[PDB]
């Protein structure tokens, strides 16, 4: 399974990014999650949300009313929408599915997408 | 929610033992699991340590991880430093609210 | 004049209690009835705590006592010395954040009240949730203690009215780390429930059994209480288990306000009566309880005041609570989210999502039939 992330390419101020992370060699129908990792330039890393096909998803308590993620199984696709994304929301989005194990573990890590707002 | 502290930078001669400590300020990191990721310049990050007892298949046997269990800190020890080890080390942990990642440390050869 | 002392944890809680009692005094007519409160902190040594509490509160001729669990993690030593010392007389003691089943036997503690659901409500809400799942194959693991036996007895007396067979039961004993034979006993059965009633870390041990007997997946749901999803037991646990927990748990200021309001109501109700004495002072020179000791407790049971912070704070015959609330969550990739809202035979579960510890969504139907027959006979020439 491989993840190819291509973004819209528009990074104009006061916009919402919705990157398409296609899955090659794998099927959307599974018990796995698909989480987004947000990396600001010259800083650490943090988790902003995830998508799971069979229902509820937990994005973040800080931006619960600001990030909404949906998934379409037929196209093997999943998209996000950051509501009221500020000018400081310029970062890198990476799509990593999961590791089952016994706890959360992001592996493998996709190439992600680059947005410079 | 909580935060994790990491040293700003480290320097060590190649072929030596390098120890990186990631401390948890709030609570106690003794029951939940922690992991150690590695990021190359211009490439996607790659995990190096999981479950603090083993390593992913294909990773060098030099890398080792342990939990202090006293100061609520996780120690990553790498023996026999090499030029290929020049990368960024991150410590990641999870809780019942969110999942947090460490600031990161870089070693200079 | 009257006074109502209490035993709190921190000085901030003492200031909150002072503000609450001042507000309560500001309420009502306050005619010939003034209630100034006093407080005292905790101590490490239980003997010192008991001696200090008697010599301080008893000497002040109090009419009620409030006790709360100290901020130290785990353990349950909070009410026992105060309850035993104040249990010599009949001055009632009000619990604040002490949920344990040992304080339900009125023979042991003959004067003890609280407003927190004991763990009998745990089994009651378990039965309430299970009445609608339509499985009728109850099997549970119980630690050999007071809490586990009480929970199992509550489950049995809840199923006695419904007239249903609760399959079998497992007893893994307390303070053990090698429990797998019980898992093999529960391996072959038509009862597809892994209901658990353990003592914290002990559950973790049998939790490891879940990782050893490979029974988790595509069935065998789990049901645990609030104390079984705290500490290492939560960490060494599989996802998909229903995270039952008691809801406004670690909140005391609202509980303090409710307690002072109900105490004031009870005092005002009791004041309009015949001649009333005062509890003795000294902790040394008095060995007799006052005449109307249990009368205050009895009138306190029948005191209802559904206006403080929450719903009807009603005391039943046992004296624990009635009509409380429960929020049952689930461990769906950790991050417990409430899925069930309970208030007493009126469950209104959240429809966020339902996930079972098998990576699926459909409720595992707990039934097996088998056509394996075991004929037996003795030989008989024309027939056998």
3-state secondary structure chain B: CCCEECCCCEECCCCCCEEEEEEECCCCCCCCCEEEEEECCCCCCEEEEECCCECCCCCCCCEEEEECCCCCEEEEEECCCCHHHCCEEEEEEECCCCEEECCCEEEEC
Nearest CA-CA partner of C338 in C237, C240, C239, C244? C244
* Chain C residues whose beta carbon lies within 8 Å of the beta carbon of residue B53: none
Q: Is A112 on the interface with B (CB under 8 A)?
A: yes
Mutate to test the interface with A, among B38, B47, B48, B88 (most CBs of A within 10 A): B47
Could you tell me which residues come within 8 angstroms of residue A29 by beta carbon, excluding any fewer than 6 positions away? A53, A73
Nearest CA-CA partner of B4 in B95, B94, B98, B91? B91
Please compute, for residue C172, the number of CA atoms within 13 A of its CA located in the half-sphere on the CB side. 28
Q: How are beta strands C65-67 and C5-7 bridged, if at all?
A: parallel
Residue C23 CA to chain centroid, in angstroms?
30
Mutate to test the interface with C, among A35, A55, A61 (most CBs of C within 10 A): A55
Nearest CA-CA partner of C355 in A108, A28, A54? A54
Contact (CB, 8 A) for B46 and A109: yes
Contact (CB, 8 A) for A57 and A49: yes
Structure tokens at C75: 């353990």
Say how far apart CA C195 and CA B63 lie, in whole Å: 41
Count CB-CB contacts under 10 A for residue C156. Answer: 13
Out of C238, C354, C359, closest to residue A31 by CB = C359
Give residue for tokens 């008697």: C54
Say how far apart CA A92 and CA A112 lie, in whole Å: 7
* Chain A residues whose beta carbon lies within 8 Å of the beta carbon of residue C358: none
Q: Is A109 on the interface with B (CB under 8 A)?
A: yes
Please compute, for residue A116, the number of CA atoms within 13 A of its CA located in the half-sphere on the CB side. 1
The resolution, in angstroms to one decimal, equals 4.4
Contact (CB, 8 A) for A25 and A2: yes
* Chain A residues whose beta carbon lies within 8 Å of the beta carbon of residue C354: 55
Nearest CA-CA partner of B78 in B44, B36, B43? B36
Contact (CB, 8 A) for A16 and A69: no
Do B90 and A45 make contact, defined as CB atoms within 8 angstroms?
Answer: yes
Contact (CB, 8 A) for C259 and C37: no
Which approach determined this entry?
Answer: cryo-EM
Give residue for tokens 């995830």: A50
Instruction: Indicate the SS3 state at residue C251.
Output: coil
Say how far apart CA C33 and CA C207 lie, in whole Å: 56
Do B33 and A103 make contact, defined as CB atoms within 8 angstroms?
Answer: yes
Structure tokens at B9: 């930078």
Q: E-assigned strands of chain C?
A: 2-3, 5-7, 35-36, 39-40, 65-67, 93-95, 113-114, 140-142, 169-171, 195-197, 223-224, 242-246, 326-330, 337-342
Using only C-alpha atoms, chain A has a radius of gyration, in whole angstroms, of 14
Structure tokens at C156: 């049995």
Terminal Cα distance for chain C, rounded: 95
Do C334 and A52 make contact, defined as CB atoms within 8 angstroms?
Answer: no
């Amino acid at each position: 399974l491989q993840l190819q992330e291509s973004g819209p390419g528009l990074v104009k101020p006061s916009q919402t990014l919705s990157l398409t992370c296609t899955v090659s060699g794998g099927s959307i129908s599974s018990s796995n999650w698909w989480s987004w990792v947000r990396q600001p330039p010259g800083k650490g890393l943090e988790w902003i949300g995830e998508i799971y096909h069979s229902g509820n998803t937990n994005y973040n308590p800080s931006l619960k009313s600001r990030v909404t993620v949906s998934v379409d199984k037929s196209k093997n696709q999943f998209s996000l929408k950051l509501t009221s994304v500020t000018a400081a929301d310029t970062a890198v989005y990476y799509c990593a599915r999961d590791v089952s194990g016994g706890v959360n573990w992001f592996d493998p890590w996709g190439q992600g997408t680059l947005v410079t707002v | 929610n909580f935060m994790l502290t990491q040293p700003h930078s480290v320097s060590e001669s190649p072929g030596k033992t390098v120890t990186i400590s990631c401390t948890r300020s709030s609570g106690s990191i003794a029951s939940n699991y922690v992991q150690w990721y590695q990021q190359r310049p211009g490439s996607a990050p790659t995990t190096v340590i999981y479950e603090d007892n083993q390593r992913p298949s294909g990773v060098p046997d030099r890398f080792s991880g342990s939990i202090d269990s006293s100061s609520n800190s996780a120690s990553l020890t790498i023996s026999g430093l090499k030029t290929e080890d020049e990368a960024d080390y991150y410590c990641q942990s999870y809780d019942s609210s969110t999942v947090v990642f460490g600031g990161g440390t870089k070693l200079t050869v | 004049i009257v006074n109502i002392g209490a035993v709190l944890s921190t000085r901030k809680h003492e200031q909150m209690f002072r503000e609450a009692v001042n507000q309560a005094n500001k309420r009502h007519g306050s005619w010939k009835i003034q209630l100034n409160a006093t407080s005292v902190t905790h101590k490490p040594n239980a003997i010192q705590m008991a001696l200090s509490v008697c010599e301080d509160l008893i000497s002040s001729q109090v009419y009620a006592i409030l006790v709360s669990h100290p901020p130290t993690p785990n353990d349950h030593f909070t009410p026992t010395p105060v309850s035993y010392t104040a249990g010599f007389y009949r001055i009632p003691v009000l619990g604040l954040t002490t949920r344990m089943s040992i304080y339900s036997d009125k023979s042991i503690h003959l004067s003890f009240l609280r407003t927190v659901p004991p763990y009998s409500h745990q089994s009651s809400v378990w039965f309430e949730m299970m009445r609608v799942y339509s499985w009728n194959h109850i099997i549970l693991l119980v630690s050999d203690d007071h809490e586990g036996r009480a929970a199992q007895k509550r489950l049995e007396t809840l199923l006695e009215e419904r007239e249903s067979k609760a399959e079998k039961v497992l007893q893994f004993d307390p303070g053990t780390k090698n429990v797998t034979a019980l898992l093999m006993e529960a391996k072959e059965l038509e009862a597809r429930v892994i209901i658990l009633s353990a003592s914290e870390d002990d559950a973790a041990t049998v939790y490891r059994a879940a990782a050893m007997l490979n029974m988790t997946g595509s069935g065998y749901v789990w049901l645990v209480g609030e104390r079984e999803i705290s500490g290492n037991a939560l960490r060494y646990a599989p996802d998909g288990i229903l995270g039952l927990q008691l809801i406004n748990g670690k909140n005391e200021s609202a509980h303090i306000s409710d307690a002072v309001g109900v105490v004031a109501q009870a005092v005002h109700e009791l004041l309009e009566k015949e001649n009333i004495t005062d509890p003795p002072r000294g902790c040394v020179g008095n060995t007799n309880i006052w005449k109307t000791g249990p009368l205050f407790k009895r009138v306190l049971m029948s005191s209802k005041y559904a206006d403080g912070v929450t719903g009807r704070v009603e005391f039943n015959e046992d004296g624990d609570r009635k009509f409380a609330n429960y929020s049952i969550m689930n461990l769906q990739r950790r991050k417990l989210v409430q899925v069930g809202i309970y208030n007493g035979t009126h469950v209104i579960p959240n429809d966020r999502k339902i996930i079972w510890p098998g990576g699926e969504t459909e409720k595992p139907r707990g039934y097996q039939m088998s056509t394996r027959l075991k004929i037996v006979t003795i030989h008989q020439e024309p027939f056998v």
